[PDB]
PDB file of C-alpha atoms in Angstrom:
ATOM      1  CA  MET R 110      86.677 100.857  90.899  1.00 19.76           C
ATOM      2  CA  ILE R 111      85.041 104.296  91.475  1.00 19.84           C
ATOM      3  CA  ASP R 112      81.818 104.459  93.559  1.00 19.98           C
ATOM      4  CA  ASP R 113      79.640 106.830  91.475  1.00 21.12           C
ATOM      5  CA  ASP R 114      80.332 110.548  92.009  1.00 21.10           C
ATOM      6  CA  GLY R 115      84.070 110.360  91.272  1.00 18.08           C
ATOM      7  CA  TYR R 116      85.148 109.274  94.787  1.00 19.33           C
ATOM      8  CA  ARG R 117      86.395 105.758  95.529  1.00 20.42           C
ATOM      9  CA  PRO R 118      86.746 103.925  98.877  1.00 17.71           C
ATOM     10  CA  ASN R 119      90.306 102.934  99.892  1.00 17.73           C
ATOM     11  CA  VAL R 120      92.173 101.339 102.859  1.00 21.86           C
ATOM     12  CA  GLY R 121      95.754 101.446 104.113  1.00 20.85           C
ATOM     13  CA  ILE R 122      97.901  99.437 106.495  1.00 25.15           C
ATOM     14  CA  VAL R 123     100.540 100.363 109.065  1.00 25.92           C
ATOM     15  CA  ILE R 124     102.681  97.754 110.823  1.00 25.74           C
ATOM     16  CA  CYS R 125     104.793  98.576 113.912  1.00 26.39           C
ATOM     17  CA  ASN R 126     107.252  96.726 116.054  1.00 26.63           C
ATOM     18  CA  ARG R 127     107.834  97.167 119.834  1.00 26.15           C
ATOM     19  CA  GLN R 128     110.670  99.627 119.098  1.00 28.43           C
ATOM     20  CA  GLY R 129     108.097 102.203 117.837  1.00 25.02           C
ATOM     21  CA  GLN R 130     109.211 101.711 114.220  1.00 22.32           C
ATOM     22  CA  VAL R 131     106.652 101.542 111.448  1.00 20.28           C
ATOM     23  CA  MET R 132     106.954  99.712 108.196  1.00 23.88           C
ATOM     24  CA  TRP R 133     107.296 101.886 105.121  1.00 26.44           C
ATOM     25  CA  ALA R 134     107.644 100.762 101.459  1.00 26.60           C
ATOM     26  CA  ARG R 135     108.457 102.133  98.022  1.00 29.98           C
ATOM     27  CA  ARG R 136     106.410 101.114  95.068  1.00 28.69           C
ATOM     28  CA  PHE R 137     107.887  99.363  92.090  1.00 30.55           C
ATOM     29  CA  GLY R 138     109.182 101.758  89.419  1.00 35.10           C
ATOM     30  CA  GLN R 139     108.483 104.764  91.672  1.00 34.71           C
ATOM     31  CA  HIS R 140     111.221 106.209  93.837  1.00 38.26           C
ATOM     32  CA  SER R 141     108.756 107.749  96.250  1.00 33.04           C
ATOM     33  CA  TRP R 142     107.717 106.113  99.320  1.00 31.73           C
ATOM     34  CA  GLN R 143     104.290 105.341 100.991  1.00 32.00           C
ATOM     35  CA  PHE R 144     102.401 103.254 103.510  1.00 32.68           C
ATOM     36  CA  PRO R 145     100.928  99.986 102.023  1.00 31.66           C
ATOM     37  CA  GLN R 146      97.376 100.661 100.716  1.00 30.29           C
ATOM     38  CA  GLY R 147      94.688  99.654  98.228  1.00 29.83           C
ATOM     39  CA  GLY R 148      91.083 100.059  97.053  1.00 29.55           C
ATOM     40  CA  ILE R 149      88.007  98.542  98.701  1.00 35.22           C
ATOM     41  CA  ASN R 150      86.466  96.260  96.030  1.00 39.89           C
ATOM     42  CA  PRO R 151      82.681  96.693  95.556  1.00 44.67           C
ATOM     43  CA  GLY R 152      80.928  94.874  98.444  1.00 40.21           C
ATOM     44  CA  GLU R 153      84.080  94.411 100.593  1.00 39.12           C
ATOM     45  CA  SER R 154      84.223  95.751 104.132  1.00 39.46           C
ATOM     46  CA  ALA R 155      87.177  97.999 105.023  1.00 37.34           C
ATOM     47  CA  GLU R 156      88.760  95.260 107.169  1.00 42.85           C
ATOM     48  CA  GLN R 157      88.416  92.658 104.353  1.00 43.27           C
ATOM     49  CA  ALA R 158      89.937  95.091 101.885  1.00 48.08           C
ATOM     50  CA  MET R 159      92.698  95.667 104.453  1.00 47.49           C
ATOM     51  CA  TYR R 160      93.539  91.942 104.628  1.00 47.06           C
ATOM     52  CA  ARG R 161      93.252  91.543 100.862  1.00 47.35           C
ATOM     53  CA  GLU R 162      95.404  94.536  99.995  1.00 45.56           C
ATOM     54  CA  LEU R 163      97.885  93.524 102.733  1.00 45.78           C
ATOM     55  CA  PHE R 164      98.397  90.298 100.796  1.00 44.06           C
ATOM     56  CA  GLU R 165      98.768  92.251  97.500  1.00 41.49           C
ATOM     57  CA  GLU R 166     101.290  94.771  98.975  1.00 36.90           C
ATOM     58  CA  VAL R 167     103.331  92.805 101.570  1.00 38.75           C
ATOM     59  CA  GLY R 168     102.448  89.149 100.763  1.00 39.24           C
ATOM     60  CA  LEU R 169     101.459  88.907 104.433  1.00 41.41           C
ATOM     61  CA  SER R 170      98.219  87.191 105.477  1.00 41.36           C
ATOM     62  CA  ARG R 171      95.849  87.252 108.424  1.00 41.62           C
ATOM     63  CA  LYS R 172      97.728  84.533 110.292  1.00 40.07           C
ATOM     64  CA  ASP R 173     100.750  86.603 110.951  1.00 39.31           C
ATOM     65  CA  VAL R 174      98.975  89.872 111.881  1.00 38.18           C
ATOM     66  CA  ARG R 175      96.569  91.227 114.506  1.00 37.94           C
ATOM     67  CA  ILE R 176      94.499  94.423 114.187  1.00 34.77           C
ATOM     68  CA  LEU R 177      95.639  96.639 117.053  1.00 34.06           C
ATOM     69  CA  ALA R 178      93.930  99.853 115.828  1.00 33.23           C
ATOM     70  CA  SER R 179      92.000 101.424 112.941  1.00 28.58           C
ATOM     71  CA  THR R 180      90.892 104.959 112.046  1.00 29.56           C
ATOM     72  CA  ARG R 181      87.716 106.194 113.735  1.00 27.44           C
ATOM     73  CA  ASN R 182      87.220 108.922 111.125  1.00 24.59           C
ATOM     74  CA  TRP R 183      87.858 108.449 107.376  1.00 25.93           C
ATOM     75  CA  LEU R 184      90.901 110.343 106.042  1.00 25.16           C
ATOM     76  CA  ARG R 185      89.526 111.850 102.889  1.00 23.53           C
ATOM     77  CA  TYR R 186      91.430 113.992 100.441  1.00 18.78           C
ATOM     78  CA  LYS R 187      90.862 115.679  97.113  1.00 18.70           C
ATOM     79  CA  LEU R 188      93.483 115.532  94.389  1.00 17.10           C
ATOM     80  CA  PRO R 189      94.895 118.736  92.862  1.00 16.23           C
ATOM     81  CA  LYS R 190      93.518 118.994  89.289  1.00 13.81           C
ATOM     82  CA  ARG R 191      96.898 118.250  87.690  1.00 14.87           C
ATOM     83  CA  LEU R 192      96.455 114.655  88.973  1.00 17.48           C
ATOM     84  CA  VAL R 193      92.735 114.455  88.081  1.00 17.67           C
ATOM     85  CA  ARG R 194      92.133 112.369  84.950  1.00 15.11           C
ATOM     86  CA  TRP R 195      89.306 114.285  83.244  1.00 14.61           C
ATOM     87  CA  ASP R 196      89.784 112.204  80.072  1.00 18.74           C
ATOM     88  CA  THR R 197      88.530 108.920  81.574  1.00 19.59           C
ATOM     89  CA  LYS R 198      85.119 108.067  83.034  1.00 17.85           C
ATOM     90  CA  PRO R 199      84.217 108.203  85.805  1.00 17.00           C
ATOM     91  CA  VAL R 200      86.869 110.780  86.699  1.00 12.15           C
ATOM     92  CA  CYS R 201      88.523 110.455  90.132  1.00 13.20           C
ATOM     93  CA  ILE R 202      88.738 113.687  92.180  1.00 13.93           C
ATOM     94  CA  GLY R 203      89.245 112.156  95.661  1.00 17.25           C
ATOM     95  CA  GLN R 204      88.968 109.066  97.876  1.00 17.42           C
ATOM     96  CA  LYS R 205      88.108 108.196 101.476  1.00 17.62           C
ATOM     97  CA  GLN R 206      90.828 106.192 103.244  1.00 16.64           C
ATOM     98  CA  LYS R 207      90.481 103.965 106.310  1.00 15.37           C
ATOM     99  CA  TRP R 208      93.761 102.906 107.947  1.00 15.03           C
ATOM    100  CA  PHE R 209      94.608  99.905 110.153  1.00 14.57           C
ATOM    101  CA  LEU R 210      97.596  99.301 112.455  1.00 15.77           C
ATOM    102  CA  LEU R 211      98.506  95.683 112.703  1.00 14.00           C
ATOM    103  CA  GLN R 212     101.376  94.187 114.630  1.00 15.62           C
ATOM    104  CA  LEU R 213     103.394  91.592 112.730  1.00 18.41           C
ATOM    105  CA  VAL R 214     103.250  88.282 114.639  1.00 18.64           C
ATOM    106  CA  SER R 215     106.522  86.557 113.551  1.00 18.93           C
ATOM    107  CA  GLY R 216     108.215  89.893 112.777  1.00 21.59           C
ATOM    108  CA  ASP R 217     109.605  91.470 109.585  1.00 21.77           C
ATOM    109  CA  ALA R 218     110.794  88.080 108.322  1.00 21.34           C
ATOM    110  CA  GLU R 219     107.180  87.348 107.206  1.00 24.04           C
ATOM    111  CA  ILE R 220     107.188  90.141 104.587  1.00 22.16           C
ATOM    112  CA  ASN R 221     107.342  89.035 100.891  1.00 19.37           C
ATOM    113  CA  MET R 222     107.388  91.920  98.390  1.00 20.64           C
ATOM    114  CA  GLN R 223     106.829  89.600  95.337  1.00 22.80           C
ATOM    115  CA  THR R 224     103.371  88.195  95.525  1.00 24.95           C
ATOM    116  CA  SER R 225     102.945  88.635  91.799  1.00 25.13           C
ATOM    117  CA  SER R 226     105.793  87.755  89.428  1.00 26.77           C
ATOM    118  CA  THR R 227     106.516  91.502  89.486  1.00 26.73           C
ATOM    119  CA  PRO R 228     107.450  92.859  92.933  1.00 25.96           C
ATOM    120  CA  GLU R 229     104.771  95.376  93.999  1.00 26.79           C
ATOM    121  CA  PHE R 230     107.493  97.215  95.925  1.00 25.98           C
ATOM    122  CA  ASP R 231     111.036  98.036  94.889  1.00 25.86           C
ATOM    123  CA  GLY R 232     112.086  98.755  98.495  1.00 27.48           C
ATOM    124  CA  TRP R 233     111.026  98.634 102.113  1.00 29.38           C
ATOM    125  CA  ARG R 234     112.420 100.012 105.389  1.00 28.33           C
ATOM    126  CA  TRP R 235     111.398 100.379 109.039  1.00 26.52           C
ATOM    127  CA  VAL R 236     111.396 103.992 110.374  1.00 25.31           C
ATOM    128  CA  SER R 237     110.297 106.007 113.452  1.00 30.67           C
ATOM    129  CA  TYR R 238     106.615 107.116 112.970  1.00 31.87           C
ATOM    130  CA  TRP R 239     107.305 110.837 112.387  1.00 31.11           C
ATOM    131  CA  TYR R 240     110.211 110.376 109.940  1.00 27.31           C
ATOM    132  CA  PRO R 241     107.837 109.255 107.269  1.00 26.46           C
ATOM    133  CA  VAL R 242     105.650 112.253 107.214  1.00 29.25           C
ATOM    134  CA  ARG R 243     108.725 114.345 106.220  1.00 24.10           C
ATOM    135  CA  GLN R 244     109.192 112.802 102.769  1.00 24.32           C
ATOM    136  CA  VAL R 245     105.648 113.248 101.380  1.00 21.65           C
ATOM    137  CA  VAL R 246     103.995 116.368  99.865  1.00 21.83           C
ATOM    138  CA  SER R 247     101.535 118.663 101.723  1.00 22.28           C
ATOM    139  CA  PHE R 248      98.221 116.829 101.231  1.00 21.28           C
ATOM    140  CA  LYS R 249      99.699 113.331 101.705  1.00 20.28           C
ATOM    141  CA  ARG R 250     101.532 114.649 104.845  1.00 19.67           C
ATOM    142  CA  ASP R 251      98.241 115.666 106.356  1.00 19.62           C
ATOM    143  CA  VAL R 252      96.872 112.154 105.914  1.00 19.16           C
ATOM    144  CA  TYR R 253     100.142 110.432 106.926  1.00 17.56           C
ATOM    145  CA  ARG R 254     100.512 112.410 110.170  1.00 14.50           C
ATOM    146  CA  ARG R 255      96.851 111.596 111.018  1.00 13.56           C
ATOM    147  CA  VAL R 256      97.547 107.886 110.231  1.00 13.65           C
ATOM    148  CA  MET R 257     100.479 107.963 112.675  1.00 16.10           C
ATOM    149  CA  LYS R 258      98.866 110.024 115.487  1.00 14.51           C
ATOM    150  CA  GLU R 259      95.632 107.974 115.373  1.00 14.98           C
ATOM    151  CA  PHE R 260      97.575 104.777 116.240  1.00 15.60           C
ATOM    152  CA  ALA R 261     100.660 106.348 117.980  1.00 15.93           C
ATOM    153  CA  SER R 262      99.010 106.096 121.407  1.00 15.74           C
ATOM    154  CA  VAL R 263      98.504 102.341 120.891  1.00 16.82           C
ATOM    155  CA  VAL R 264     102.153 101.974 119.788  1.00 15.84           C
ATOM    156  CA  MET R 265     103.529 103.483 123.048  1.00 18.97           C
ATOM    157  CA  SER R 266     101.571 100.988 125.155  1.00 18.92           C
ATOM    158  CA  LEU R 267     102.360  98.291 122.533  1.00 17.39           C
ATOM    159  CA  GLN R 268     106.046  98.795 123.357  1.00 17.98           C
ATOM    160  CA  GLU R 269     105.361  98.573 127.130  1.00 12.16           C
ATOM    161  CA  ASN R 270     102.982  95.687 127.473  1.00 14.06           C
ATOM    162  CA  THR R 271     105.583  94.273 125.220  1.00 12.93           C
ATOM    163  CA  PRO R 272     102.358  92.952 124.196  1.00 15.57           C
ATOM    164  CA  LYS R 273     103.711  89.877 123.431  1.00 17.76           C
TER     165      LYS R 273
END
């Protein structure tokens, strides 16, 4: 889906545990790594798209998550023109991203990377929140560090409440 003017709305998910580790995964047939994410379908809300795309990425469903935080501002970015697909219509030049921190309810056991017959991810790991930002390129880094910092303050207190 693209909205109209070559932007498209998008959402992403972060999970942490009470050790201050965040989930990270690696998409099938890539060897590069990302936070779980997906597009808002036309007429979805950001939170509905979050729960939908969570199922598509992690196989996880609403039952075994809770929203602990979400981005107050949208993390927008423009692509460099090498990645722009001028040949197709409408052309994408950027997206707005809303992110959501959930805590896993049963823990990492409730992840299934093969929702479809094809695994959507080739790999997954749990990592400290700042480690991830190191692997990505400049414009994804900017988003990924925002995604971490925006929710980081909840994670500290989420280790201490041991909000159960």
